[model samples]
Target: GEFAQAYKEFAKAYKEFAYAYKEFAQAYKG
Candidate 1:
């Protein structure tokens, strides 16, 4: 139970950050 609760913060932020990183990875388009 305690360990499961700890997963939220990192996993939550990683979802957003993962998308953001992919978007930013669009650099080579130019």
Candidate 2:
């Protein structure tokens, strides 16, 4: 259970980071 929770948090952070990076890339390109 603890591992699952930890994984969920990591996944969430990864998603946010990925989205932010994608936005930054698009802005830079434009």
Candidate 3:
């Protein structure tokens, strides 16, 4: 149960970071 919550947060943050990194890549490419 504890790890479930922890992993959920990790997944959410990872998704956010993934998008942010995508944006960074686009700008860098420009």
Candidate 4:
């Protein structure tokens, strides 16, 4: 249970940061 919860949080953060980079790229391109 705990492992899954932690994994979810980690995955969420990773995706968020990835999206942040993606947004940055979009902004830079613009």
Candidate 5:
């Protein structure tokens, strides 16, 4: 249960970070 919860949170954070990074790259390019 604990590992599952941690993994879920980490995945969520990684997804958010990935999207933010993409936006940042786009903005930098523009």
Candidate 6:
């Protein structure tokens, strides 16, 4: 119930966060 919904939201947010972090790290290096 609540667990599934929370997990989906967390996954979606984590995906965006991970992409953003990757870009930020690349920019820092380059």
- TM agreement with the true structure for every prediction: 0.52, 0.82, 0.81, 0.70, 0.85, 0.77
1-30, model 1: which lDDT tens digit per residue?
A: 877887987799899999998888886564
For residues 1-30, could you state the per-residue lDDT of candidate 2 as single tens digits?
899999999999999999999999999999
Question: What CA root-mean-square deviation does each model show from the true structure?
Answer: 1.8, 0.7, 0.7, 1.1, 0.6, 0.8
* Candidate 1 residue pairs in backbone clash: none
Model 2 Cα shift for residue 23 (angstroms): 0.4
Question: Of the candidates shown, which would achieve the greatest TM-score relative to the real structure?
Answer: 5
lDDT string for model 6 (1-30, tens) is: 999999999999999999999999999999
Instruction: List candidate 6 segments past 4 Å from native.
Output: none
Q: Provide the overall lDDT of each model, using Cα atoms, as 2-decimal numbers.
A: 0.85, 0.99, 0.99, 0.99, 1.00, 1.00
Overall local distance difference test of candidate 5: 1.00
Candidate 4 backbone collisions, by pair: none
Q: List the lowest-lDDT window of 10 residues for candidate 2.
A: 1-10
Model 2: clashing residue pairs?
A: none
lDDT of 6: 1.00
Q: In candidate 1, how many Å is residue 10 off?
A: 2.0
lDDT of 4: 0.99
The residue ranges of model 1 lying beyond 4 angstroms of the native Cα positions read 1-3
